[PDB]
Design a protein around this ligand. Structure first.
Ligand code: ATP
Ligand code: ATP
Ligand code: MG
Ligand code: MG
Lengths: 401, 102, 231, 842, 398
């Protein structure tokens, strides 16, 4: 029995009511939106910054002189030298050319396998170039020590000692191992529950690594083009070999080191196979201690987990009571806490909680102390934080006693 | 679609599934962007049972990808950005199988 | 472990039975109980862990009279603890009946372990409760600790429950062979207050003592305040 | 189509309208009566579309002609009523109103609510269209309003009634039509609408509101609106009209907070107590008690404030051993502002003279001023601790000692007024600097006093041609501060004669920019009496004439929020031509001044200032940060701080100076950790340029002023009670600051102390009727409304139960969470008298 | 530095109801808008050196200018730039290019003919990421949420308070929670609390769907996540909102599919950015999921998501607050006693306590009434509550 609306009904509904100010307000809103759009269009620039130096820095009219005189040179590698000598040059992907040197360079300068520049017209070799240093692989280095030391890692004395015996002791004091004929393990696989502190130990090692520390970004190794990830792994391991006693950290190794299956991952599997032979196989790896971490060790290919590539498998178990107390002290060193805080009770109230949950509890206690305007967080704040962080995420406890 | 005087974009059951991961979400986003550009518009999703079924857990059993497309559609219809002048008509038997988010 | 820990009848690669350890973990969820054995006698202090003021404090049983000369402290599952305590009482009464003598604390602990041992020997699950047996016998004051696995060993001062690790560590520091009952009780109360979430008072702890000559004496409301006054 | 009843009704109505064809006796009366009944029943129902009205699309032209021809009495009126009700939906505006005007009167309510609303709109439109040429049509509209207003009052339509009454420029009807249950709604609506509606209607609206509260005997709010209009006789009348002692005390305390000191009469009960409270002598004790409660009584060291330990000491142990005059002045300003108002310091009270000796001329003057700047609100103790430097070995230190004495007394008034006695024999003192110090001491101690003795003594100072130009500017600033926002006739004439007598050769100097400052300060907040001022100023030759005109015009409308005047200022800024740039600088400062009145104005002025900063010229860009600082004084808005940080590194130096000063002013007393980190980073970055580092330390001092317990906002009581003395001091500082090198960084470093005239605390200490500290659970949060026009006091949100005393940030409002007491004043700011609730029983 | 690019928003009008005070407020805002328009329109017109330098630079640069990747820096006036087609060119670095920004991996701007480097592209942000940035802040503020107070307080302490009042956290010594997860039944107020935070927040707000982070190509997913977080870091104070996290945050499991293993890789890149080697910076992540039991434990562990805010179905007080919020605009009648519908059994969510409002309005329109009545609300509830089929047991329990 419902009846549809007509034109007169619509008109009366939109008129029979409030019309003394509704029309004016609606028009004002529409025109305010229009004015905002007009202003945005009028400015609508946000001039994007470009690398233009200060006016005095360049102030050069000879830049045109160098542009007109100097000529761009394609970079290519001389695969072979022919004997007037002729040179076979691979212009990356363009084509293969058989060119001869320009008078500027001497024949002795150009050697087989060296990447040299060539003119865009005749392809003559004009100048040698330093061997390629990959930009992503080079940026994969640390060159900035994180500010987390071994004193910030608590409850893992045995694990930390094993990690040092793997990545630090063999580098600092090779004599203790050479005298007894002991080859120190070259790799460590830090596997444990998430938030237990593997990455913290890795950061501590990088902090006191006193060598080349390379953090392997799982994103770069997985590349869009086929064969690019294996090339990146091969470049990273070469850059590690050129240095002395390098340290490679394969964070979240389960990102690429999945179990092979029969297209599936395929390309990532090829990159994994490239890392496997680099770590172990022909052509000994050298002084490159590999550090791998993963919260899910069961998905790794058995080849990558075999004790020839990851020699020492450190298990980062949930901290025991002493470990939890030490973690609480470490994370509460800066907190303005009262002097009677029984950290033992807070440790015993977090039965199975990693270091990350302990830090969360400490931050929650601080936030509770901030809620009520108190600058000192009493033990009651810590108890409430423990309830909120662990217990939050009676009849069941009734049976127990 | 006859008496509409308005763009009446149509989406069948399996048109948003797609093989390559992320193609369903991209297709849904392009569909909604085009509908907004041609606003007002009505999107008809016949046989929404295909994509939009009750959400299943992860693991080999779960379809996952269709789940991602359905999540994209859910955000589009009611998310951070509220659609203006875009009405969706979805017809599907078995009303009880559709997840309690669509 | 997920495939080997679904029964006391399965052996883990280590050879561990991954169901008794779960029983120990379950006993780890009970209220802390402390027992100190001294030449003068044996003292048992525990945590009430009262959940609601409406509940009768005497309804929840942590220290019970297994016999007039042996006291038992519970920490863990209520049902297993009650069954084991009743079996201990029955065994003590049977020994008195047949042999006209008070069964030694070692004998009662053995009897209770026997029932704690039939955890699937074809005449269920391990009894998820640890009992601290304290009493005086022909050998003098004694304290015996039992775990769901059935292993029982004499302990001078054992702490069991939620705060087992810290309580035991502090007991090692605060225990000596020449302690008297008063100092032992004071130390036990101090330790319990140290490892107690709520401020210690007369409504959250029940203290039990068993000295030679006298019987199992559980401190009453008035008595407990007298001891907590100084600590 | 239509339903059975629908078509039946439509056919019946068509037949009824058709029966109006010829003129038989028994057709018009029955047809008209039935049409009236149907229309009334339809409209006097729910908002449903009035089916009789929808079906009614005949033509009344024949009906209108018969209406005019026959029965000019009842039948004509009935036809007019029917046609007017019909036109309520259609567009017959003039005819829609006229048919009701000439039709049967009956009553508006008998027809329908929507009809009454439409009639109110029609009346407003006609009144707007009806000018003063003919009053013949005026009376009928007044008669219609006479009944329209009560209908809205009775049916919860206060908004519509207020809109109609203030739309026809006639508001007095509220004086009698208001009801007890609706005084709050009308008062809140008019208070909200006062700011956004211009003059002279603004003045009439404010006066009518005052009348409403006076009729309802709402004394605090009536006084609030009297301050609104700045009508002193209104304040005196309200003071007379009080019979209640507790309300008396609360109003006296509030008026002391405003800074307007009215002469008290011994006849009033508790004259001594009320005068002492309104002279906020005990405010020092209350602030010290709050500091003790917060356990922050320990003085902070400038070394700690700069956090030199944390900064990357690239030059360790060799780059900080040079104590120049400028960095000494910066450190003095820091160990002042920061430790200010606590009445104590571990480096200034004990090592004042040795540190002072290291400065030269202006620097030592500023150090001596900061000497007393340490102890604000402690009159006797401050004077005792500063007399030793007042007797300093160097006679030049005496001016700084006088400045410090005035700053100590700043914000506190003593009945015997030591400052005037101290300066009586020194105002004529030949050396310029000591007289300057005495005058500034008088200004800080006697900020806003408006005591005729001080102005009369300054008149010889104005006529003292022997005084130097800087002394002349200081005297003008002091005379303006004495009569801030008063339009002092004697001072007006004095400044008028001085500025006309001024010479162009001695006017081209940069120090001649304070005379318009004083003119505006005297005429600050009163824009109805400056046209003659501009006419007189037209005599002076350009370009200084343009700057003086612009500054006087801006200060005439300080806070009035006039869109047209801001438009003229924007025009002035938009045209590109020093003094010509002074025009644009004062224009930008005026944009900020007028925009600060309302939240919407300030928020939009932020965008306008950013736009003119990214488009403007060097003078506009220089004036931008000062305008932003003035708009958001002691309101550390994150967007404003971000823009100031973005422009703090600008290649133009003066832009950097102004940006750093704006950072310091905006975060006055906020103790913003982000702002503090930004200031520290800027100080590290500008470690080479002495001036940038000096004013970065200055900004740090302003931000840490009172250790987060002092606020320089020129507004109060929910950020609406503008502070006349505070605003005047702010304009003086800003005008002295548009040119920093010559004044701020030149020979007049002591000008920045003028802003201390705006110093005020922010706190939530609660007392009892005896005035003893009475702790009470108080909820704290931002006053953000969650409803429409229900007239709610902002529906305090972000509740945080706190025990008084508590700290309320800018725009932060806390309410008396305990119904045990009812405040004498509805607001909850500063100290309040918690009146025990008699209605509630424990 | 590149400080926050906070979204622009006009001030709020309080009256809401179409009273003349709202008209005055809107007129004032429009006046200031016309003010700005006139000022900026006169500036260029009223406007009447560096032109020589600009002309010289642009004539040396020429057009069009190719955007390429800098591979290495050989000398101070020579570098190897690889054009977009993968071909490396040994081009000459011109004087007018700040050598400080020239670093390997940067997007260099090259002359089209000689390929000589002429400028360094600064932003070069992935277009699929620059879209995420919130420019127009949503109009839904905090007053537009009924209840969810505890939740509002937690979200404010996580994403809002730290910027405004960092003093408290600095003195207490605790780093403010930098990650919050919003989980709960559907239609509870998760995306709303996100919209309100974006409206009030002064930091750059980035919105993602959890499905746009997945790209068809292999390495595009992790690289897109890295680009998003790099853009968030570029604007120091930022809030990143990943709604529908359960799209890519499903529990990691051995998947015999590159699709699944690619999605897992995207999740791993996300969790590496959130809390891994190198600090995350001052970027706060807000995530919403109507399913938190299916998320990878690593993603929702403390350190990445520090406050697992729960969003329950509204209770009686919250339901009354959502009726007041969604009926304030509506012209209710005198007999509308909302408590009758507010009672409910247990299962009325905001969406419903709003669709119910919309349905009541529509049913009022059906009877030609713009003022709703109690019967309209009851019918609307009966019509719009038909969501769950049974969701209940039988008459077993007593
Ligand atoms: N054992 C620990 N001691 C102290 N702090 C810890 C510990 N474990 C974790 N934390 C704290 O938690 C932060 C994050 O933990 P971390 O990233 O090391 O966990 P993880 O186990 O490596 O994580 P995932 O397995 O998910 O990769 C650390 O930076 C540190 O602050
Ligand atoms: N508590 C509430 N207060 C006010 N409005 C609410 C509330 N809950 C829901 N709403 C309204 O209903 C809409 C739906 O809520 P919201 O968008 O937060 O859903 P959600 O929790 O994100 O659910 P989904 O899982 O479907 O994304 C809101 O945009 C708002 O208009
Ligand atoms: Mg990690
Ligand atoms: Mg959502």
């Amino acid at each position: 029995p419902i009846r549809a609306l007509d034109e007169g009904d619509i008109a009366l509904l939109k008129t029979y009511g409030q019309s003394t100010y509704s029309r004016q307000i609606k028009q004002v809103e529409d025109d305010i939106q229009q004015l905002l759009k007009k202003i945005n269009e009028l400015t609508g620039i946000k001039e994007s910054d470009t690398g233009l130096a200060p006016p005095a820095l360049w102030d050069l009219a000879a830049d045109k002189q160098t542009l007109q005189s100097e000529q761009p040179l394609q970079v290519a590698r001389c695969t072979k030298i022919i004997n007037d000598p002729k040179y076979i040059i691979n212009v990356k992907q363009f084509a293969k050319f058989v060119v001869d040197l320009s008078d500027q360079v001497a024949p002795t300068d150009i050697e087989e396998g060296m990447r040299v520049g060539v003119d865009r017209n005749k392809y003559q070799i004009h100048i040698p170039l330093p061997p390629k240093i990959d930009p992503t692989v080079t940026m994969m280095q640390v060159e900035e020590k994180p500010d987390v030391t071994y004193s910030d890692v608590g409850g893992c004395k045995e694990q930390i000692e094993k990690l040092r015996e793997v990545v630090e002791t063999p580098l600092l004091h090779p004599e203790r191992f050479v005298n007894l004929g002991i080859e120190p393990p070259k790799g460590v696989l830090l596997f444990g529950p998430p938030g237990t502190g593997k990455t913290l130990c890795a950061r501590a090692v990088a902090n006191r690594t006193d060598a080349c520390f390379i953090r392997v970004i799982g994103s770069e190794l997985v590349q869009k083009y086929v064969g690019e990830g294996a090339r990146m792994v091969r470049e990273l391991f070469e850059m590690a070999r050129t240095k002395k006693a390098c340290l490679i950290f394969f964070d979240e190794i389960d990102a690429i080191g999945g179990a092979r299956f029969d297209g599936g991952d395929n390309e990532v599997q090829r990159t994994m196979l490239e890392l496997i032979n680099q770590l172990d196989g022909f052509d000994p790896r050298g002084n490159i201690k590999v550090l791998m971490a993963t919260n899910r060790p069961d998905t790794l290919d058995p080849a990558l987990m075999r004790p020839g590539r990851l020699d020492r498998k450190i298990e980062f178990s949930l901290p025991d009571l002493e470990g939890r107390t030490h973690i609480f002290k470490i994370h509460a060193r800066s907190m303005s806490v009262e002097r009677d805080i029984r950290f033992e009770l807070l440790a015993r109230l977090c039965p199975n909680s990693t270091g990350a949950e302990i830090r969360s509890v400490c931050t929650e206690a601080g936030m509770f102390a901030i809620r009520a305007r108190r600058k000192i967080a009493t033990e009651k704040d810590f108890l409430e934080a423990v309830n909120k962080v662990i217990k939050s995420y009676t009849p069941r406890y009734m049976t127990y006693n | 679609a006859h008496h509409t005087d308005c763009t009446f974009i149509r989406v069948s059951g399996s048109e948003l599934v797609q093989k390559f991961i992320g193609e369903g979400a991209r297709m849904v986003r392009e569909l909604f962007v085009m509908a907004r550009e041609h606003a007002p518009s009505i999107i008809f999703m016949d046989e929404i049972d295909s994509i939009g079924s009750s959400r299943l857990e992860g693991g080999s059993g779960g379809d996952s990808e269709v789940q991602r497309t359905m999540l994209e559609l859910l955000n589009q219809l009611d998310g951070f950005e509220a659609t203006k002048n875009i009405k969706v008509i979805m017809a599907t038997n078995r009303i009880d199988i559709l997840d309690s988010a669509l | 472990r997920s495939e080997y820990d679904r029964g006391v009848n399965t052996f883990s690669p280590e050879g561990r039975l991954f169901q008794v350890e779960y029983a120990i973990e379950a006993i780890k969820l009970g209220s802390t109980a402390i027992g100190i054995q001294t030449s003068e006698g044996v003292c048992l202090a525990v945590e009430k862990r009262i959940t609601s003021p409406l509940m009768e404090p005497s309804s929840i049983e942590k220290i019970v009279e297994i016999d007039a000369h042996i006291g038992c402290a519970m920490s863990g599952l209520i049902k297993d603890a009650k069954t084991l305590i009743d079996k201990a009482r029955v065994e003590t009464q049977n020994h008195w009946f047949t042999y006209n003598e008070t069964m030694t604390v070692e004998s009662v602990t053995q009897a209770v372990s026997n029932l704690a041992l039939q955890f699937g020997e074809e005449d269920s699950r391990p009894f998820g409760v640890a009992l601290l047996f304290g009493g005086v016998d022909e050998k003098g004051p004694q304290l015996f600790h039992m775990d769901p696995s059935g292993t029982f060993v004499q302990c001078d001062a054992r702490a069991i429950g939620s705060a087992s690790e810290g309580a035991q560590s502090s007991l090692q520091e605060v225990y000596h062979k020449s302690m008297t009952l008063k100092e032992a009780i004071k130390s036990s109360l101090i330790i319990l207050k140290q490892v107690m979430e709520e401020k210690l008072n007369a409504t959250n702890i029940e203290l039990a003592t068993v000295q030679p000559g006298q019987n199992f004496h559980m401190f009453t409301k008035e008595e407990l305040e007298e001891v907590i006054k100084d600590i | 189509e239509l339903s059975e009843e629908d078509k039946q009704l439509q056919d019946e109505l068509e037949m009824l309208v058709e029966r109006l064809g010829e003129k038989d006796t028994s057709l018009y009366r029955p047809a008209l009566e039935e049409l009236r009944r149907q229309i009334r029943s339809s409209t006097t129902s729910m908002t449903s579309v009035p089916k009789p009205l929808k079906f009614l699309r005949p033509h009344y032209g024949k009906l209108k002609e018969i209406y005019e021809n026959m029965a000019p009495g009842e039948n004509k009126r009935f036809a007019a009523d029917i046609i007017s009700v019909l036109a309520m939906t259609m567009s017959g505006e003039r005819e829609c109103l006229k048919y009701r005007l000439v039709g049967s009167q009956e009553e508006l309510a008998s027809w329908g609510h929507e009809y009454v609303r439409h009639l109110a709109g029609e009346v407003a439109k006609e009144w707007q269209e009806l000018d003063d040429a003919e009053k013949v049509q005026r009376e009928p509209l007044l008669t219609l309003v006479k009944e329209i207003v009560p209908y809205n009052m009775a049916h919860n339509a206060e908004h519509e009634a207020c809109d109609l009454l203030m739309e026809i420029e006639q508001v007095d009807m509220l004086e009698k039509d208001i009801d007890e249950n609706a005084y709050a709604k009308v008062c809140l609506y008019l208070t909200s609408c006062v700011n956004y509606v211009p003059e002279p209607e603004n003045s009439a609206l404010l006066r009518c509101a005052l009348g409403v509260f006076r009729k309802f005997s709402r004394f605090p709010e009536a006084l609030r609106l009297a301050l609104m209009l700045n009508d002193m006789e209104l304040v005196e009348d309200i003071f007379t009209s009080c019979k209640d002692v507790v309300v008396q005390k609360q109003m006296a305390f509030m008026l002391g907070r405003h800074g307007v000191f009215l002469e008290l009469s011994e006849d009033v009960e508790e004259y001594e107590d009320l005068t002492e409270i309104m002279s906020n002598v005990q405010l020092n004790s209350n602030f010290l008690a709050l500091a003790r409660e917060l356990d922050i009584m320990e003085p902070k060291v400038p070394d700690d404030i700069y956090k030199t330990h944390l900064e990357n000491n690239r030059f360790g142990g060799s780059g900080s051993q040079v104590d120049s005059a400028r960095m000494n002045l910066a450190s003095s300003f820091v160990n002042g502002f920061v430790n200010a108002a606590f009445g104590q310091d571990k480096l200034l009270t004990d090592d004042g003279n040795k540190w002072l000796y290291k400065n030269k001329d202006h620097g030592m003057l500023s150090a001596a001023a900061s000497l007393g700047m340490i102890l604000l609100w402690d009159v006797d103790g401050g004077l005792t601790q500063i007399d030793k430097y007042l007797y300093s070995s160097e006679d030049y230190i005496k001016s700084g000692a006088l400045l410090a004495c005035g700053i100590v007394n700043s914000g506190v008034r003593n009945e015997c007024d030591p400052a005037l006695a101290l300066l009586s024999d020194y105002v004529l003192h030949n050396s310029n600097t000591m007289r300057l110090g005495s005058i500034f001491g008088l200004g800080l101690a006697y900020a806003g006093s408006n005591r005729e003795d001080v102005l009369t003594l300054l008149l010889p100072v104005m006529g003292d041609s022997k005084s130097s130009m800087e002394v002349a500017g200081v005297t003008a600033l002091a005379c303006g501060m004495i009569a801030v926002g008063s339009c002092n006739g004697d001072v007006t004439s004095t400044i008028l004669q001085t500025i006309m007598e001024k010479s162009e050769t001695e006017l081209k100097d940069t120090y001649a920019r304070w005379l318009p400052l004083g003119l505006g300060l005297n005429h600050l907040g009163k824009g109805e009496a400056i046209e003659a001022i501009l006419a007189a100023l037209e005599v002076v030759s350009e370009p200084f004439r343009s700057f003086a005109n612009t500054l006087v015009d801006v200060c005439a409308y300080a806070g009035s929020g006039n869109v047209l005047k801001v438009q003229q200022l924007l025009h002035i800024c938009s045209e590109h031509f020093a003094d010509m740039g002074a025009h644009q600088g004062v224009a930008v400062l005026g944009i900020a001044l007028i925009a600060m009145g309302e939240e919407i104005g300030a928020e939009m002025a932020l965008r306008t200032f950013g736009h003119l900063l990214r488009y403007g010229e060097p003078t506009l860009r220089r004036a931008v940060p000062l305008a932003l600082a003035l708009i958001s004084v002691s309101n550390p808005r994150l967007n404003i701080l971000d823009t100031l940080s973005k422009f703090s590194h600008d290649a133009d130096p003066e832009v950097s100076y102004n940006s750093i000063f704006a950072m310091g002013m905006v975060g006055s007393g906020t103790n913003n950790a982000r702002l503090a980190a930004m200031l520290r980073q800027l100080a590290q970055y500008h470690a080479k340029d002495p001036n940038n580092l000096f004013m970065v330390r200055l900004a740090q001092g302003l931000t840490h002023l009172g250790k987060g317990t002092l606020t320089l906002c020129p507004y109060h009581s929910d950020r609406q009670l503008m502070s006349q003395v505070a605003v005047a001091g702010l304009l003086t500082v800003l005008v002295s600051f548009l040119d920093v090198r010559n004044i701020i960084l030149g020979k007049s470093h002591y000008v920045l102390y003028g802003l201390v005239a705006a110093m005020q605390p922010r706190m939530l200490v609660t007392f009892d009727e005896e005035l003893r500290p009475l702790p009470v659970s108080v909820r704290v949060g931002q006053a953000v409304d969650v409803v429409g026009q229900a007239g709610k006091p902002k529906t305090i949100t972000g509740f945080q139960t706190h025990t008084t005393p508590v700290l309320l940030a800018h725009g932060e409002r806390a309410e008396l969470a305990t119904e045990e007491f009812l405040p004498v004043t509805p607001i909850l700011e500063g100290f309040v008298i918690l009146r025990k609730n008699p209605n509630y029983d424990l | 530095t590149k400080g926050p690019d906070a979204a622009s928003k006009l001030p709020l009008v309080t009256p809401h109801t179409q009273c003349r005070l709202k008209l005055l407020k809107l007129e004032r805002i429009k006046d200031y808008l016309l003010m700005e328009e006139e000022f900026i329109r006169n500036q260029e017109q009223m406007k009447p050196k560096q032109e020589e330098e600009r002309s010289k630079v642009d004539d040396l640069r020429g057009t069009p200018m190719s955007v390429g990747t800098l591979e290495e820096i050989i000398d101070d006036n020579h570098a190897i730039v690889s054009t977009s087609v993968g071909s490396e060119h040994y081009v000459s670095i011109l004087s007018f290019v700040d050598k400080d920004l020239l670093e390997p991996g940067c997007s260099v701007l090259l002359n089209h003919k000689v390929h000589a480097v002429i400028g360094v592209l600064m932003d070069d942000t992935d277009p699929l990421v620059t879209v995420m940035k919130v420019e127009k802040a949503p109009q839904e503020t905090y007053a537009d949420i009924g209840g969810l107070d505890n939740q509002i307080q937690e979200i404010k302490e996580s994403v809002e308070l730290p910027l405004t009042h960092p003093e408290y956290y600095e003195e207490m010594g605790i780093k403010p929670p930098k990650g919050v997860i919003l989980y709960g039944p559907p239609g509870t107020g998760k995306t709303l609390l996100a919209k309100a935070v974006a409206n009030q927040t002064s930091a750059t707000f980035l919105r993602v769907v959890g499905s746009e982070l997945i790209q068809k190509y292999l390495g595009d997913g992790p690289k897109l996540v890295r680009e998003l977080f790099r853009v968030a870091e570029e604007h120091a104070p930022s809030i990143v909102f990943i709604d529908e996290i359960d799209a890519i945050g499903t529990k990691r499991y051995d998947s015999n599919s590159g699709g699944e293993r690619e999605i897992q890789r995207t999740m791993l890149e996300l969790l590496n950015q959130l809390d891994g080697f190198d600090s995350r910076g001052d970027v706060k992540v807000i995530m919403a999921t109507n399913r938190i039991e299916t998320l990878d434990p690593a993603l929702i562990r403390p350190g990445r998501i520090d406050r697992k805010i729960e969003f329950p179905l509204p209770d009686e007080k919250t339901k009354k607050r959502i009726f007041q919020i969604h009926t304030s605009r509506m012209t209710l009648a005198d007999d509308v006693t909302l408590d009758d519908l507010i009672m409910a059994k247990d299962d009325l969510s905001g969406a419903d306590i709003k669709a119910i409002c919309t349905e009541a309005g529509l049913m009022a329109l059906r009877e030609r009434r713009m003022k709703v009545t109690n019967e309209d609300f009851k019918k609307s509830k009966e019509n719009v509550l038909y969501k769950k089929q049974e969701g209940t047991p039988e008459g077993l329990y007593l």
